Design a binder for this molecule. Structure first.
Ligand SMILES: *[C@@H]1O[C@H](CO)[C@@H](O[C@@H]2O[C@H](CO)[C@@H](O)[C@H](O)[C@H]2NC(C)=O)[C@H](O)[C@H]1NC(C)=O
Ligand SMILES: *[C@@H]1O[C@H](CO)[C@@H](O[C@@H]2O[C@H](CO)[C@@H](O)[C@H](O)[C@H]2NC(C)=O)[C@H](O)[C@H]1NC(C)=O
Ligand SMILES: *[C@@H]1O[C@H](CO)[C@@H](O[C@@H]2O[C@H](CO)[C@@H](O)[C@H](O)[C@H]2NC(C)=O)[C@H](O)[C@H]1NC(C)=O
Ligand SMILES: *[C@@H]1O[C@H](CO)[C@@H](O[C@@H]2O[C@H](CO)[C@@H](O)[C@H](O)[C@H]2NC(C)=O)[C@H](O)[C@H]1NC(C)=O
Ligand SMILES: *[C@@H]1O[C@H](CO)[C@@H](O[C@@H]2O[C@H](CO)[C@@H](O)[C@H](O)[C@H]2NC(C)=O)[C@H](O)[C@H]1NC(C)=O
Ligand SMILES: *[C@@H]1O[C@H](CO)[C@@H](O)[C@H](O)[C@H]1NC(C)=O
Lengths: 50, 106, 170
């Protein structure tokens, strides 16, 4: 299929109307970030020649 | 940068070769329409909100903080005066209460 | 197509697999980059049919209905101003979908300010939104309201100068 970007949401804009929140949600989200790699050492003489 | 929504705090967690941030954020919800105006015209003077916004539920005008609905009476303590009513486009007529008025009235 | 060359090439091992894997990683990384930059909203916001923004003109940045590509005049100018076993993979997001993402971002930031980036899109009049931005930089709301026509004229003039500068600089 041809992918859809997102659901369409036409915001009801007018020159004298505002939307004010009456409530709130305390939302906890996860962010995973790599920090380090495996520290690998290669003996060049032993690798090439044994 | 620290999660989706208005960032409140974050908690770090160790992970194998990594870090996991638990971002605690504030998300607005249950929004409601109100009729808004840039300024309030009272006694030939233009009043602007000191920290909030003017909202109307249909018949009465209030001032509330922008991120949560908490309507309060439009007074001189939460508004400031700058100029007359002839300049601001879309200014509406409403009364501005004075807390000092019952003190000298009594 | 030489069979003998491929037979001799097999003596060198998995070099070809390494090169193909690296190129594949780059190719998926480009699509990931485009997703990270442009696909930050899951709602496709649209502007109202009446462009009453308190004097502010956004015609040079909003999509043009007359164009089949649905691009803005600035975006159209930007697209006009940019000119043996090898294959070119097409990008995952086409130009019209990227333009649609930018249009959604523009509609959200015009009709809702910064509210759509933090949660549900909350409508606010554009002069009031500009006044909020003025308060963000430490200038009182009254300054914005009193000089609203001047601010709108300056903004429109600056946007036109941006289009002229892009059209006039190679
Ligand atoms: C604020 O008012 C507007 C206009 O009355 C509402 O927008 C309409 O909402 C209905 C409800 O589903 C939709 O069917 C219409 O298509 C909307 N119109 C437009 C132009 O967007 C809006 O929902 C109201 N918001 C709140 C929080 O009550
Ligand atoms: C704001 O939303 C919260 C939901 O997070 C509402 O809390 C719920 O209230 C109902 C009825 O009192 C309870 O049955 C639910 O269990 C509550 N949920 C939680 C998580 O406590 C709260 O009442 C809403 N407030 C307003 C003013 O709408
Ligand atoms: C807008 O809000 C105001 C205040 O919350 C409402 O005024 C109250 O209306 C109730 C119901 O008639 C009365 O019992 C109260 O005494 C009123 N308070 C004041 C200070 O007048 C007003 O009715 C609301 N308007 C709408 C359309 O909901
Ligand atoms: C808000 O109040 C002002 C001042 O009371 C109104 O301006 C008056 O409008 C009438 C009608 O044309 C004129 O005859 C007066 O001379 C005006 N007075 C001033 C000082 O300008 C204004 O019309 C009111 N607006 C609303 C919507 O009620
Ligand atoms: C917003 O700006 C656009 C372009 O700057 C204005 O469109 C111009 O309108 C005049 C008069 O009708 C034409 O002579 C120009 O050729 C138009 N320019 C383009 C690029 O189409 C538009 O009128 C402005 N105002 C509104 C409300 O959209
Ligand atoms: C909003 O626009 C209407 C015309 O569509 C106008 O009559 C009204 O005064 C405007 N209100 C503000 C606050 O600009």
């Amino acid at each position: 299929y041809t992918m859809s970007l997102g659901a369409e949401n036409s915001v009801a804009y007018s020159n004298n109307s505002i939307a004010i929140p009456t409530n709130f949600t305390i939302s906890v989200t996860t962010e995973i970030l790599p920090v380090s790699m495996t520290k690998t050492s290669v003996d060049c003489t032993m690798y090439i020649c044994g | 940068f620290c999660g989706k929504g208005y960032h409140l705090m974050s908690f770090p967690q160790s992970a194998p070769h990594g870090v996991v941030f638990l971002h605690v954020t504030y998300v607005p919800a249950q929004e409601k329409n109100f009729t808004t105006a840039p300024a309030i015209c009272h006694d030939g003077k233009a009043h602007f909100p000191r920290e909030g916004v003017f909202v109307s539920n249909g018949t009465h005008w209030f001032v509330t903080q922008r991120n949560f609905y908490e309507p309060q009476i439009i007074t001189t303590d939460n508004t400031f005066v700058s100029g007359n009513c002839d300049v601001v486009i879309g200014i509406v007529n409403n009364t501005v209460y004075d807390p000092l008025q019952p003190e000298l009235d009594s | 197509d030489s069979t003998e060359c491929s037979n001799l090439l097999l003596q060198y091992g998995s070099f070809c697999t390494q090169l193909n894997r690296a190129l594949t990683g780059i190719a998926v990384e480009q699509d990931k980059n485009t997703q990270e930059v442009f696909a930050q909203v899951k709602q496709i916001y649209k502007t109202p049919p009446i462009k009453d923004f308190g004097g502010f003109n956004f015609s040079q940045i909003l999509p043009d209905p007359s164009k089949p590509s649905k691009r803005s005049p600035i975006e159209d100018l930007l697209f006009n101003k940019v000119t043996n076993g090898l294959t070119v993979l097409p990008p995952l997001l086409t130009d019209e979908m990227i333009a649609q993402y930018t249009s959604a971002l523009l509609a959200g930031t015009i009709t809702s300010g910064w509210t759509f980036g933090a949660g549900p899109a909350l409508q606010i009049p554009f002069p009031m939104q500009m006044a909020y931005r003025f308060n963000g930089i430490g200038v009182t709301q009254n300054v914005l309201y009193e000089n609203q026509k001047l601010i709108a004229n300056q903004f429109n003039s600056a946007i036109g100068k941006i289009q002229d500068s892009l059209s006039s600089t190679p």
